[PDB]
Design a protein around this ligand. Structure first.
Ligand code: PC1
Ligand code: 3PE
Ligand code: LMT
Ligand code: LMT
Ligand code: LMT
Ligand code: LMT
Ligand code: LMT
Ligand code: MYR
Lengths: 104, 127, 67, 459, 120, 80, 55, 155, 56, 171, 86, 172
């Protein structure tokens, strides 16, 4: 069932050529012939250029442009609980009424 | 072993097709000349595909026939008959009349409700 | 490189990779045992389930069948 | 408008008096300068249009179309100068003259204040377009394509001429400002049914309307690249622009006269999107894509709501830049393999990486990826059609599914897969070709930042 | 639970219908029922921005827990006692609803007896 | 750098489930001629693998010991 | 050729391993309550998930 | 190509059937036009309706991705049968049986969901009770109407 | 509000900077993958500050 | 500040005072101080510099006032010169009314966010004001079509006024 | 992966055959024809190719496999498919 | 069918072994059942009546279809496998190097010097390859897709370029 002698011979001759071709794909020592052309400090300039400069720009943008227009930044108002003291007015929020203080 | 029931989208495996087996000298003759046509077309292609001086596209007449057969050759071979007219009427006029009554009926209902005040449009001011 | 392939043989291992795997496998079981000790309720039930058939008719205000 | 008409005319002496080796450099440079000054048209007011004289006016509808028209002339020159390189010098100058004369008729068509002046210029564009297709097309079928283009248009235009003259006789004026104040309602009658049809059929053929679209796959395929760029980007929008203006004088009859044409469009787009799935010719696929998109414009114009007019205006501009870019992309392949068959050259992303990026960006805009102005227009039209009838969401939704399939099918078939082995002349993309692609996509994507200038008068 | 087996595979005429319960007067069989007491005022729940589903009869314990949570930040393990107080209160609320279901069932049982005996 | 493969004479089915297969085949009068090609999978560091129960209990020994040590510390920390 | 000794591989999985152990506990104990957790039920409803998993 | 090599009309005579088969690089025995029903096929050969996914992967196709050879007649529906689209390869389970089991599973699950909606599961618990006339004011009730009082008692 | 709003936007802006650098030829493609990974790690840190304020 | 508080109202702010019940340090407190020093301060100085430049070049711009012209009600039919002015006026008032509905919608959205879980009751005034303004806007401008005009608006009003007369006639 | 070599491939091809109980490991050489020299049949050859697929982790199509009748042919086929040139 | 009876039985053997291996999974269990399956094939090895042999093959195929694995094992790089055609996007034809800019070619002066020699070797051999094919092909074209070797010294096997210079299986 195997190869015929003609089949074997053609494979033999292609094989020599293919292996020579693959060998020629190897790069020479000088190639490629390029044309003319520690963590802390490395991590510091990243924080500077990617965190501080952007937050500077964004804070300036929000503080003097976005927040000077109505309803651009809308916060949910703080939760007020009994016993809290309001900073704006100093009003003291009354405590809740006495519980049955039942425990279990 | 329940037998294989071929479908349009689930073809019959060759290993279960009787035509594959019980081969005759007449079938082996057909295969030989089928393989000849493929071998002759392969040689014609390879002689161009391997030509060092060829730079371009190897024009394939089979591809040209295919794109031409599915465009320019259709009307010359068209005949208005019972099959084409019924199909043309069904798939050309059919859907248009259908969607007309769907939208006309739906829009007539809506207009009637709006006239009487029974359609809620409380916040509808964009259209 | 640091590790070379072997033929039909169990591969080479580093001490670091084996120790770290054991430590995090052990840390998993400490966590489960630690939480189970302090939080068995979250797995078994936080509160008793009353047996409704144990409630008296006067608790539920079911009047006598006469009146 | 003389500050644009006169310099556009002066392009003709410039081309004819140029050195034989500078006709493309000079015309391209100076058509870009005209394109620059067209931005002065964006002095638009909230209430009043910009009315220059008794002849010409500009409003938020005509202004973006004018800016698109004057921008396309430079791009058509770069796209053409490769395949006309061997052409005789005087025939090269005539080719440029046809493009310039086409621009002149277009910028006057979009700004003519009187409808009969609009009609004459609307019709005058046929001549240069017909000459471009039949003289400088490549195939035998270009002659037949010109005949279909000519007689499909004229069969609708001639009834329009009679209708307009009848309207002037009875109203006394065709000036569009006058028609805004002297308009009277159209009451039902068989006489008015045919006035309505004569006022709308010329514009429907240009769009084109489904059923009357057969001229476009022929014409958009047989034309040279520049001819296809203007046909898809601008000339199809003469139909949409005309409808947007004349529907003013057709109310309330548009209420029931729109039904047959809304049905043709709603179903037409699904039919013409499905056609694109089984198209074997890349240019033909793109052409059938234009029919699908312009079906939305027809529906938006007919239902006549503030949102649909904004959406229609955005779609016309967005489609112009996208469809033009796709023809140019397909032409670059054709200039390499000299065939329009889509399956012929595959896996091109492997051989032409940057040009595969343009293919992707063009495909994404075509399938209306948000927030592109293609999506903005297509979404506004869907919003208003839903109100017109909720069930239309089913047809709009299906079309959006099919449109993505053929947009990415074209991208996958040509750019992905394995390269065809025997095609060995795929040279690297030229600077001209890369610049031509980026001059479509970059303005198209920039407009997303400021979309209000392409939303028309009802913004 | 078994209650479903009784209502679906058994006789649903003597089984509470969860959608329509209660079907008897509150005071039937209960001479002088106390009215449930609410500790937290409407304004207090409003100012605490409780979720409406959380503004039940145990809301006063929830307010204490939320206040403790804020004041103990970042110690996210404090306020355990406050959380339990709220959890226990909700357990007692749930038990009450269980009793209301048993009372409804026992009355529907009685209403059948008082109809069968009368019927015969 | 030639990869020296282990000597092939060391792979033997004796003492592996492959030997059981050969005995069940020997009863019917058959042989398994590829058994020695599979033997490396039942030999060396691949012999004896954890069960599914053992796999889950990886690290349970040290984790439990830490747990025992931790509660002792916590317990006495409360008492004192 | 088995080899899992690259630090990129180890560190990336190690962080998600710490997450798969404690992240659920941290998040649950820091998120505010927004419902009424239903903590009363029969034993067979409480342990259902645990039992069917073991089976 | 020249006009003699392009597709033509339906072949009427055996001499035209032999010319068409030669034109399409087919054996006259294997050449079969579509039926002449006026649908526009002409003499384009009718080839078996099988996906390209069904062809031999290991053969040296001139177009390996398409699994076509240069010059062989392409199926009329070639673009529908590329490996990205319609697949016709044999299935381990018969098509009709496949449909029965899929539909049967879906229909049964839909039926069982309807049953489960008729006999819902729930706990033996009375309705949850809320204060202040059932949170009438909180839920957006009108403050200018006194609501139908809702009273909840102890138990 | 100023810190919460400011920090919750730098997170989103931080993630686009590798995209802007790549698209605007101002990067050292030596170890771009490490650059992108580093930016994500820093976004996570800045995103924790708004979350802690919400938790509080 | 910059906008009118009356057009864009905001209830008084009530922030509770810190009441730490833990010995631990609050990370947010020290993060806030770092933010003020490293972000707010340098940003503020850069702005104060820019404001020093804007004070050296102070110049003004004005809000256009439009005198009232006769409405389309006063225009003789087909008198384009008077129709044009009335039509332009009507279009100016149409755009302004669109922005009025936007102001009322922006109040409503701000209230919903500000009130948190209590919005359903604490934003009933803004809901009512939004409902009334949207009703008025719908009456003026709804269903006019893309080719709307003062003439069409008048016809819509007259049709509405006629129905109101008839309904009263029933009473 | 660690690159293959012609000597590397040959060693493993012979390694597998030496673990096949129907081949004498002393009469075996890279040139031994499976039928003529080693006395195997075709059913055996299918198993040998199946064992080389498992060994090197890739499939050899049946049309190719049936023609590999000596260990050298298997070595040559594998090196060709894996671009091994040494 | 162009496969002999032998090739069909041998193919069925391998296919059934692979599907058996997918069911068994464990190597020892597979070895046990692979030998029972081999015994079944050996039981009719000498069947002489071609008619009875063909019927045996027909039944075996019917049995294989009934018992095949619905999800058999596929080698990752085999057709249908999870790595099939994974690297086709990295295979770039060699002719693309002719379009490289000179500044790109100057980076690999040694590589492109060898490349020129290969292109020279392709030109100078082409005519002999065409002539050899012409003179060994019977009238009416070839009957098979087989190709001859080179018959002389210095002759290259006809139609070799795209076999020898095809992209590497792992190009990048
Ligand atoms: C970073 C996060 C990731 C976001 C993606 C990056 C994109 C955002 C970066 C840009 C931010 C700056 C910005 O948006 O401001 C721009 C601003 C939009 O923001 P703006 O409206 O607030 O303007 C800012 C200036 N003031 C404050 C005075 C209003 O302007 C523009 O958008 C410019 C519009 C360009 C469109 C013009 C196209 C050129 C026309 C040439 C004619 C030929 C074309 C063809 C004709 C077609 C028909 C018309
Ligand atoms: C029934 C009840 C169950 C629920 C039904 C809900 C709808 C779900 C069904 C969605 C439509 C089904 C078609 C999906 C087609 C698809 O997914 O593409 C994959 C297909 C082959 O992919 P694959 O099977 O993975 O093959 C692997 C290689 N052999 O490759 C392809 O052929 C796709 C590429 C060719 C383009 C064909 C486009 C077909 C369009 C029909 C789909 C629907 C179109 C939009 C209309 C639906 C919305 C109303
Ligand atoms: C927050 C909780 C932290 C809990 C941390 C608990 C301490 C961490 C323990 C790390 C274990 C390191 O030690 C590791 O243990 C395993 C199991 O015994 C040892 O494995 C042991 O059994 C196997 C087989 O039974 C032998 O092959 C091995 O020689 C033997 O030492 C490893 O050789 C050793 O390296
Ligand atoms: C793509 C093609 C689309 C085709 C669309 C077809 C639209 C058909 C519109 C039909 C309505 C025409 O408008 C209709 O004309 C007739 C004229 O006879 C008018 O009616 C007038 O003539 C009819 C006689 O037939 C009398 O009944 C009536 O007393 C008289 O006033 C109607 O008052 C008017 O409603
Ligand atoms: C090519 C695709 C073909 C698809 C089929 C499309 C069929 C389209 C038929 C055109 C419309 C015909 O039906 C049209 O309905 C509208 C109402 O909506 C009528 O409109 C008129 O009558 C209505 C009441 O009937 C009155 O309010 C008013 O006098 C006027 O609106 C038209 O008199 C009638 O002609
Ligand atoms: C834990 C899982 C929880 C969800 C369980 C859901 C169960 C869903 C069961 C759906 C069963 C539907 O599938 C049903 O099977 C039988 C058996 O083949 C089919 O019946 C078929 O098989 C045999 C022949 O091979 C014959 O009985 C019959 O001639 C044929 O139709 C039914 O036509 C099909 O309707
Ligand atoms: C509207 C934008 C507002 C913010 C504008 C701020 C612009 C500041 C840009 C600085 C440089 C950005 O672009 C890029 O940054 C990274 C990090 O420094 C550098 O990348 C460097 O660090 C990273 C990781 O630390 C390494 O993976 C990489 O090998 C190295 O080159 C690039 O060399 C530089 O080109
Ligand atoms: C009754 O309480 C309604 C609950 C509906 C089904 C819940 C499923 C619980 C199964 C209990 C069996 C015990 C096995 C752990």
């Amino acid at each position: 069932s195997g190869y015929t002698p003609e089949e074997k011979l053609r494979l033999q001759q292609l094989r020599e050529l293919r292996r020579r071709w693959l060998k020629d794909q190897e790069l020479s020592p000088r190639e490629p012939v390029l044309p003319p052309q520690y963590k802390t400090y490395r991590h510091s300039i990243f924080a500077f250029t990617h965190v501080l400069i952007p937050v500077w720009i964004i804070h300036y943008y929000l503080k003097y442009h976005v927040t000077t227009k109505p309803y651009t930044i809308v916060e949910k108002k703080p939760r007020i609980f009994p016993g809290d003291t309001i900073l704006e007015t100093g009003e003291v929020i009354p405590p809740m009424k006495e519980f049955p203080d039942q425990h279990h | 072993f329940p037998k294989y029931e071929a479908s349009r989208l689930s073809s019959l495996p060759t290993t279960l097709d009787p035509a594959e087996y019980d081969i005759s000298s007449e079938t082996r003759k057909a295969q030989a000349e089928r393989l000849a046509i493929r071998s002759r077309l392969k040689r014609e292609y390879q002689l161009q595909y391997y030509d060092p001086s060829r730079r371009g596209v190897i024009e394939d007449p089979a591809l040209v026939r295919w794109t031409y057969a599915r465009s320019a050759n259709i009307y010359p071979n068209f005949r208005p008959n019972t099959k084409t007219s019924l199909l043309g009427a069904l798939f050309g006029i059919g859907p248009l009349v259908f969607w007309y009554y769907v939208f006309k009926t739906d829009r007539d209902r809506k207009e009637k409700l709006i006239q009487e005040g029974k359609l809620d449009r409380t916040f509808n001011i964009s259209y | 490189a640091h590790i070379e392939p072997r033929y039909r043989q169990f591969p080479q291992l580093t001490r670091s990779q084996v120790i770290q795997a054991e430590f995090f496998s052990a840390t998993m079981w400490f966590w489960i045992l630690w939480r189970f000790w302090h939080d068995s309720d979250a797995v078994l039930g936080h509160f008793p389930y009353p047996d409704p058939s144990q409630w008296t008719d006067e608790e539920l205000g079911i009047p006598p069948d006469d009146e | 408008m003389l500050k644009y008409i006169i310099p556009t005319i002066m392009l003709m002496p410039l081309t004819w008096l140029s050195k034989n080796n500078m006709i493309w450099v000079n015309s391209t440079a100076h058509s870009l300068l005209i394109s620059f000054t067209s931005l002065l048209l964006m002095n638009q007011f909230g209430d009043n249009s910009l009315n220059f004289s008794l002849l010409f006016f500009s409003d938020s509808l005509s202004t973006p179309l004018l800016i698109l028209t004057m921008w396309l002339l430079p791009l058509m020159l770069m796209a053409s100068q490769h395949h006309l390189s061997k052409e005789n010098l005087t025939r090269k100058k005539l080719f440029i003259t046809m493009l310039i004369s086409l621009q002149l008729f277009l910028i006057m068509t979009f700004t003519a204040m009187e409808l009969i002046l609009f009609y004459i210029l609307f019709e005058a564009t046929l001549v240069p377009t017909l000459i471009i297709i039949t003289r400088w097309g490549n195939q035998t079928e270009r002659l037949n394509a010109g005949l279909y283009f000519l007689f499909y248009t004229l069969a609708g235009s001639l009834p329009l001429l009679v209708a307009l003259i009848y309207i002037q006789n009875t109203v006394g004026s065709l000036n569009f400002l006058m028609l805004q104040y002297w308009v009277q309602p159209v009451h039902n009658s068989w006489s008015n049914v045919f006035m309505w049809l004569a006022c709308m059929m010329a514009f429907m053929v240009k769009m084109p309307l489904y059923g009357l679209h057969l001229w476009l796959p022929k014409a958009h395929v047989e034309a040279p690249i520049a001819g296809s760029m203007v046909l898809a980007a601008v000339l199809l929008k003469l139909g949409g622009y005309g409808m947007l203006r004349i529907t003013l004088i057709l109310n309330p009859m548009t209420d029931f006269m729109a039904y047959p044409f809304i049905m043709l469009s709603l179903w037409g787009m699904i039919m013409t999107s499905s056609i694109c799935l089984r198209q074997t010719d890349l240019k033909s696929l793109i052409a059938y894509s234009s029919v699908s998109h312009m079906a939305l414009v027809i529906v938006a114009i007919l239902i006549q709501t503030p949102w649909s007019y904004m959406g229609a205006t955005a779609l016309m501009i967005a489609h112009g830049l996208t469809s033009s870019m796709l023809f140019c992309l397909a032409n670059s392949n054709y200039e390499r393999i000299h065939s329009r068959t889509m399956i012929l050259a595959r896996g091109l992303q492997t051989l032409l990486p940057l040009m595969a990026t343009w293919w992707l960006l063009a495909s994404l805009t075509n399938l209306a990826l948000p927030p592109t102005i293609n999506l903005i227009g297509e979404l506004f039209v869907v919003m208003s059609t839903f109100s017109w009838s909720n069930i239309t969401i089913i047809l709009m939704g299906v079309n959006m599914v099919i449109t993505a399939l053929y947009s990415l099918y074209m991208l996958i078939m040509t750019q992905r897969g394995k390269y065809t082995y025997h095609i060995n002349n795929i040279s690297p993309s030229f600077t001209r070709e890369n610049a031509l692609m980026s001059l479509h996509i970059l303005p198209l994507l920039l407009l997303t930042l400021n979309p209000k200038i392409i939303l028309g008068p009802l913004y | 639970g078994a209650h479903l087996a009784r209502r679906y595979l058994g006789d649903a005429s003597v089984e509470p219908d969860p959608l329509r319960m209660p079907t008897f007067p509150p005071d039937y069989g209960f001479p002088e029922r106390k009215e449930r007491e609410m500790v937290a005022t409407q304004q207090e729940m409003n100012d605490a921005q409780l979720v409406l589903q959380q503004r039940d009869y145990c809301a006063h314990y929830l307010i204490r827990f939320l206040k403790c949570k804020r004041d103990s930040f970042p110690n996210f393990l404090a306020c355990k006692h406050e959380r339990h107080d709220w959890d226990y209160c909700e357990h007692l609320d749930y038990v009450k609803r269980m009793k209301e279901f048993e009372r409804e069932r026992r009355l529907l049982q009685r209403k059948k007896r008082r109809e069968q005996r009368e019927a015969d | 750098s030639k990869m020296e493969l282990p000597d092939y004479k060391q792979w033997k089915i004796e003492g592996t489930p492959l030997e059981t297969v050969q005995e069940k085949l020997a009863a019917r009068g058959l042989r398994d001629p590829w058994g020695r090609n599979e033997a490396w999978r039942y030999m060396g560091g691949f012999a004896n693998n954890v069960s599914f129960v053992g796999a889950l209990l990886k690290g349970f020994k040290w984790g439990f010991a830490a747990f025992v040590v931790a509660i002792g510390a916590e317990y006495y920390l409360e008492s004192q | 050729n088995i080899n899992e000794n690259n630090p990129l591989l180890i560190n990336s999985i190690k962080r998600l391993l710490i997450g798969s152990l404690f992240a659920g506990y941290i998040i649950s104990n820091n998120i505010p309550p927004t419902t009424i957790p239903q903590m009363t039920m029969p034993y067979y409803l409480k342990t259902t998930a645990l039992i069917v998993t073991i089976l | 190509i020249t006009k003699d090599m392009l597709p033509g009309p339906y072949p009427k005579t055996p001499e035209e059937r032999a010319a068409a088969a030669k034109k399409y690089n087919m054996r006259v025995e294997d050449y079969e036009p579509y039926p002449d029903d006026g649908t526009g096929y002409g003499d384009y050969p009718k080839l078996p309706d099988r996906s390209q996914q069904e062809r031999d992967p290991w053969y040296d196709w001139d177009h390996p991705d398409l699994r076509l050879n240069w010059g062989e007649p392409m199926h009329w529906d070639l673009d529908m049968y590329i490996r990205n689209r319609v697949d016709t390869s044999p299935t381990p389970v018969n098509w009709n049986l496949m449909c029965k089991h899929l539909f049967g599973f879906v229909a049964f699950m839909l039926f069982m969901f309807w049953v489960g909606e008729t006999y819902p599961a729930y706990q033996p618990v009375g309705p949850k009770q809320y204060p202040y006339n059932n949170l009438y004011l909180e839920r957006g009730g009108d403050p200018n109407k006194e609501p139908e009082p809702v009273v909840h008692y102890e138990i | 509000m100023n810190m919460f709003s400011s920090l919750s936007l730098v997170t989103l802006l931080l993630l686009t900077m590798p995209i802007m650098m790549m698209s605007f030829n101002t990067y050292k493609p030596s170890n771009y993958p490490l650059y992108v990974k580093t930016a994500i790690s820093y976004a996570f840190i800045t995103s924790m500050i708004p979350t802690m304020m919400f938790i509080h | 500040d910059s906008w009118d508080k009356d057009v864009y109202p905001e209830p008084p702010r009530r922030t509770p005072a810190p009441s730490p019940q833990t010995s631990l340090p609050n990370p947010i407190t020290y993060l806030t101080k770092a933010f003020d020093l490293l972000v707010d301060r340098p940003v503020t100085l850069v702005r104060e510099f820019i404001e020093r430049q804007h004070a050296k070049n102070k110049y003004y711009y004005y809000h256009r006032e439009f005198r009232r012209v006769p409405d389309i009600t006063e225009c003789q039919e087909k008198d384009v010169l008077c129709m044009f002015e009335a039509e332009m006026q009507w279009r100016r008032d149409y755009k302004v009314d669109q922005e009025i509905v936007n102001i009322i919608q922006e109040r409503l959205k701000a209230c919903q966010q500000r009130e948190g879980e209590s919005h359903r009751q604490n934003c009933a005034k803004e809901l009512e004001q939004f409902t009334q303004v949207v009703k008025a806007y719908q009456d003026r401008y709804h269903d006019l079509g893309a080719h709307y005009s003062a003439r069409k608006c008048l016809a819509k009003q007259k049709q509405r006024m006629l129905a109101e007369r008839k309904a009263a006639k029933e009473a | 992966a660690p690159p293959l070599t012609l000597e590397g491939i040959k060693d493993r091809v012979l390694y597998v055959l030496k673990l096949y109980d129907k081949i004498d490991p002393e009469k075996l050489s890279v040139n031994s024809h499976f039928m003529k020299d080693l006395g195997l049949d075709s059913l055996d050859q299918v198993e040998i190719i199946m064992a080389m697929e498992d060994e090197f982790g890739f499939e050899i199509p049946d049309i190719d496999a049936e023609k590999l009748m000596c260990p050298q042919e298997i070595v040559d086929y594998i090196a060709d498919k894996k671009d091994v040139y040494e | 069918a162009y496969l002999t009876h032998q090739q069909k039985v041998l193919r069925l053997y391998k296919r059934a072994l692979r599907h058996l291996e997918s069911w068994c999974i464990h190597r020892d269990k597979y070895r046990y059942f692979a030998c029972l399956l081999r015994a079944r094939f050996d039981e009719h090895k000498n069947e002489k009546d071609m008619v009875k042999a063909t019927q045996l093959l027909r039944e075996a195929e019917e049995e294989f279809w009934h018992g095949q694995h619905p999800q058999p094992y596929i080698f990752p790089e085999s057709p249908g496998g999870t790595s099939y055609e994974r690297y086709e996007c990295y295979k770039v034809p060699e002719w693309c190097l002719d379009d490289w800019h000179p500044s790109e070619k100057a980076m690999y002066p040694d590589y492109f010097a060898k490349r020129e020699q290969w292109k020279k070797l392709r030109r100078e051999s082409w005519e002999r390859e065409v002539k050899q094919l012409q003179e060994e092909t019977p009238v009416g074209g070839p009957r098979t897709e087989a190709l001859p070797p080179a018959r002389k010294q210095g002759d290259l096997p006809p139609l070799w370029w795209h076999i020898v210079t095809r992209p590497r299986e792992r190009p990048m």
